[PDB]
Amino acid sequence: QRTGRSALAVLIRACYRLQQQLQRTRRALLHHSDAVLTSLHHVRMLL
Amino acid sequence: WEHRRFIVADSRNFITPEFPRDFWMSPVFNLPRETAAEQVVVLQAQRTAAAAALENAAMQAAELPVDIERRLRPIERNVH
């Protein structure tokens, strides 16, 4: 019984965690362009 | 033996220059509290500051191709 039942665990562990890989990448990479915008706005301040 | 003519160094000695009618009212004797020189200096300093800051921003933001490849390629390998 535990052949296919455990075989499904591999695909579950891969896909269900690749799911939130994209979530963490979204949470992190969005916090990068805000700094660029802040820097360019400070540059506009200095002129 | 050293000889020369002498003229007395008197306190009564005064010098008499002459002034033209258009002397005192030169435009630069009378100046306001705010002229263009101070703004020029401050504006040039600000321009140099912004020139430095844009370069700093350029070197601070030059990681986008690296900040995206290292986020996308490992997921490609994981799926592949």
UniProtKB/Swiss-Prot annotation, chain A:
Proteolytically processed, possibly into several polypeptides. Enzymatic activity is only detectable following cleavage of the UL36 protein, which occurs late during viral replication. It comes from the Viruses. It is found in: Virion tegument; Host cytoplasm; Host nucleus. Large tegument protein that plays multiple roles in the viral cycle. During viral entry, remains associated with the capsid while most of the tegument is detached and participates in the capsid transport toward the host nucleus. Plays a role in the routing of the capsid at the nuclear pore complex and subsequent uncoating. Within the host nucleus, acts as a deneddylase and promotes the degradation of nuclear CRLs (cullin-RING ubiquitin ligases) and thereby stabilizes nuclear CRL substrates, while cytoplasmic CRLs remain unaffected. Interacts with host CUL1 and CUL4A; these interactions inhibit the E3 ligase activity of cullins. Interacts with inner tegument protein. Interacts with capsid vertex specific component CVC2. Interacts with the major capsid protein/MCP. Interacts with VP16; this interaction is important for outer tegument association to the capsid. May form homodimers. Belongs to the herpesviridae large tegument protein family. This is Large tegument protein deneddylase. It comes from Human herpesvirus 1 (strain 17) (HHV-1).
Curated annotation (Swiss-Prot), chain B:
Residues 1-37, 1-38 are annotated as: Interaction with major capsid protein/MCP. Capsid vertex-specific component that plays a role during viral DNA encapsidation, assuring correct genome cleavage and presumably stabilizing capsids that contain full-length viral genomes. Participates in the interaction between the capsid and the tegument through interaction with the large tegument protein/LTP. May mediate the capsid docking to the nuclear pore allowing entry of the viral genome into the host nucleus through binding to host nucleoporins NUP214. Belongs to the herpesviridae CVC2 protein family. Heterodimerizes with CVC1. Interacts with major capsid protein/MCP and triplex capsid protein 1/TRX1 at the pentamer vertices. Interacts with the large tegument protein/LTP. Interacts with host NUP214; this interaction might be essential to the capsid docking to the host nuclear pore. Interacts with host TMEM250. This is Capsid vertex component 2. It is found in: Virion; Host nucleus.
